[model samples]
Target: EPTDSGAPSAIVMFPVSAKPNPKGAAMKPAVFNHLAHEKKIANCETCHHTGDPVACSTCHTTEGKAEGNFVTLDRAMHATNIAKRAKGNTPVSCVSCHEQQTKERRECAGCHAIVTPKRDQAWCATCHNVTSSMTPEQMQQGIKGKLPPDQNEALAAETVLNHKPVQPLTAMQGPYKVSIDALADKYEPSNFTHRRHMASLMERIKGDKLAEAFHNKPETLCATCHHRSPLSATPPKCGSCHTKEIDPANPNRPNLKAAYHLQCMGCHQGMNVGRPKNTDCTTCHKARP
Candidate 1:
């Protein structure tokens, strides 16, 4: 008498074709567990990259007549992109599939964290386990009634501008303690209200829970615009980072003078603060008599 094992199981297999033409060889069917890998990758696009299971026809086509590798449209559901070898068929190879994910839930972790909450579940099998109940149509219908509402309205309502909350003016601080005269000699220093912008960003930051989590410190936000070469609260002069180069090879690299003007004008234009328009260069620069 044969011993009976009472565990759920399914066989998984990959078929290889010896066909010289697109349709010349037959493949043997292999089988494996229908749900062995779902715990690792629940999202289809992470591997499938085919933009939903039903849309495969957009990229895959037969020899003008035989649908789905001659395995019939019904069998096509289980067919791997492996045989298709189309633009998106590149599998979870060494870097994409086998590589260890970096910290902060990058690459595979980002999507997997969102989709599969449970451990020891077959995350990848959620898509690969091609059973009749797990077809794309069934998945779509199952999720249709449970879809979340669009959130644009909530986002817009949260980002209201309040000029009153912003402080009128304040001093601008460099990485190091330098006098305005010294800064002006090297680069034209703009009269930026460090307090006002700080206040504005503070209010916006408070309103935004997401920003608060990502930008834990106010100084971190300031560093985005007020970055220094030395990466210190006190760094070298502006010229230290923004060196002078009249005939620069790189178009993106700006000289000390151009860098100062670009930063000032760019911010003025972006924030839409204190001026009707920034088109007039003379507003900040004096015209030579």
Candidate 2:
């Protein structure tokens, strides 16, 4: 029975297919940490869509259902383009909500921007790794009733706990400080403390599970500065694409100066690092002799 408090305390595992997957699943069932998700999401309606607590399969079926406007259960969960409706009735899918978080949250955006936002076979197990022993009947009963404490719920919790990287990165292994002398005409080259900056950024999100999960690769951290290029320890120099002068043809593309300022200032401002605001230019680049 659900607690009177109305807070979910167990995990909900969703099968890969809406129908009985008899051929032995290519991947495990998707384990959703109901408690954790509830905290992160705005409300029940975000996933439920009906503004009331009910299983998605209630409306969305395997093939297509009238209640769900003929949208299949697979599309309902994985669809990225869920249209917004009138009277605050915006329908959101799993992919859509996570994509929105990556865009809106600075901690997430830094890494997510560099990587493709789509899920693949490799990432499938992150959510889908429920115990193979449970039957479809048991799974449905668990969701409809109080989730079993020992079996599916425990397995799901363990999966999430194990997902976090063993060691959270503290600092870059490369150069401690980088001399930005690319555009030294007006200002004496800036001494960017690379290690210190990386350390600070990592420290800010030391125990953040959301940041840990999406930041899957080590190179993800470096992509903040070395963006729009291949993920590598030594990516191409920023000046390669962002030249000294902005391209008149490409008015949208910022010049090297603007690129540097935007990356640095935008990150600081977005994270609420208030010490050296944009107006205080000398803080980053010293004036030339």
Candidate 3:
């Protein structure tokens, strides 16, 4: 006999289209792995806010359909501030559960708590991975609600099957050291060992799937330090944005000296590193004459 294998179609693609996509750009649908989540969760109601396995888009649409209390798909999927119906109860939307993972779980909090994640296209592509097999025309037709259910299942299967697990960048790939001299007038240059920091971070998250998966891009690890700009191999000097003195326009932006201290101290605090204590000013740099 053939491989006796079957379960409820294991994946559910999000933003299933009832109408054609808008604007000059196309829609990139998110792929939800139902089978994997179902096995981990004891009750389906954890995600099924309405107590059924119905499609979320049935109520929550792009423009916020009437029956869904006008909750747009974007808000329904990532409303970090949603009001809870029950104590410790969960709801739909990838963020509701996954965002908490970065907070409640100590392993994830260190980097994530220090820096807010960039919601750039690269981050979106991690889950919104609809592969090229559908062909543009067929995919469009499907979006217009023309495809049979069989085709949708096949597309979801191909996407899930072909999905390549993320590979984190090796610590050796990044620069070995960074020389900080913005406040050299008062203190000697602080030699920030880039490789050592990467090594420490990598070691801490060893075999952590949550870290590997969400940190989808190679430059992700560096974001906690060189943030508010594009992920890059040659990130700008901290002084470029922090400046020697804070600009009046950006009253909240710290000066170069404060920037360095805040970044290091915040991460250390979040990670529970007690070494070279935050109060030890001379530990990072020697006093200048």
Candidate 4:
């Protein structure tokens, strides 16, 4: 048949960090049928649109930044809803090319009659080539007549939540001094509570599957915030690794405040954790200054 009857031309799959939510009970690999679409459309322009069969990145790159002619694959495929189309202002949807098949017999009969108007339409070419021909009744006999609806064909489900559960690092000595003053004299310990952070982390672990999947072990999630020491309920002082001064010499390494803030805020941002809604600074630190 002109329709691609062969196996898929390509298959792409990636590991999803978050767990599937209400829809995705059983996580399954996503599959794309390249050959199937090829059977219906003779040219790649049907989908590629740019006349080039290769992926868009072949020409476009950060170094060259090809523009005004061909768009990169990322721009073509991932263009947001706000993006504009070549011909019109509105963005294109998948259905624009994959013409909807109305009647079941139309699949074979329509193609056959269009190919050959004279003589008894032969069914051979109809299943094999573009010039194929066949009668409507003959094609109807071959048609399966609306097979059972495929329940498995639906889109895979995705998880609603994204943040990993925060677990505590090792316990530390009471009110460990973290020097804020630069005079080599003044300092105030930024009392870290491994026990409390651990408790809160446990609370976050209540019912998230995606979080549980990635954070399979408590130590895994704990490492994000609770670091600079070994994996123990009780570890050395914060000053053990975090130096007092914000060293401008070392751009990568952060000072005490930056280090703590970076560690705290970075994870929160990465996991999309928010304040007042999920967690607050008060949740971790004491009120008295």
Clashing pairs in 3: none
Q: Give the TM-score of candidate 1.
A: 0.34
- Supply the TM-score for candidate 4: 0.31
**lDDT of prediction 2:** 0.68
Candidate 2, residues 104-125, lDDT tens digits: the string is 7776554454444435554565
Tell me, by TM-score, which candidate is best: 3
Q: Considering lDDT, where higher is better, how would the candidates rank from best to worst? A: 3, 2, 4, 1
Off by over 4 Å in 4: 1-188, 227-241, 261-289
Question: Which wins on lDDT, candidate 2 or candidate 4?
Answer: 2
Q: Each prediction's Cα lDDT score?
A: 0.36, 0.68, 0.71, 0.36
Question: By TM-score, is 1 or 2 better?
Answer: 2
Residue 47 accuracy (lDDT) in model 3: 76
Best by lDDT: 3
Ranking the candidates on TM-score from highest down gives 3, 2, 1, 4
lDDT of 3 by residue, 1-289 (tens): 1112233344435554445564314557666666666665667777777776677777787678676888887787777877776765556577767787777666666676678777777767776787678666656555555656677777877887887666666778888987777678778888888899889887877876556667887777877788887778778888888877777886779988788888887777776777777987787877786
The per-prediction CA RMSD against the true structure, in angstroms, equals 18.6, 5.0, 4.1, 21.4
lDDT of 1 by residue, 175-278 (tens): 22222332353334344454555555445335432233233332444444455442244445556566666435545566777765566555554444466245
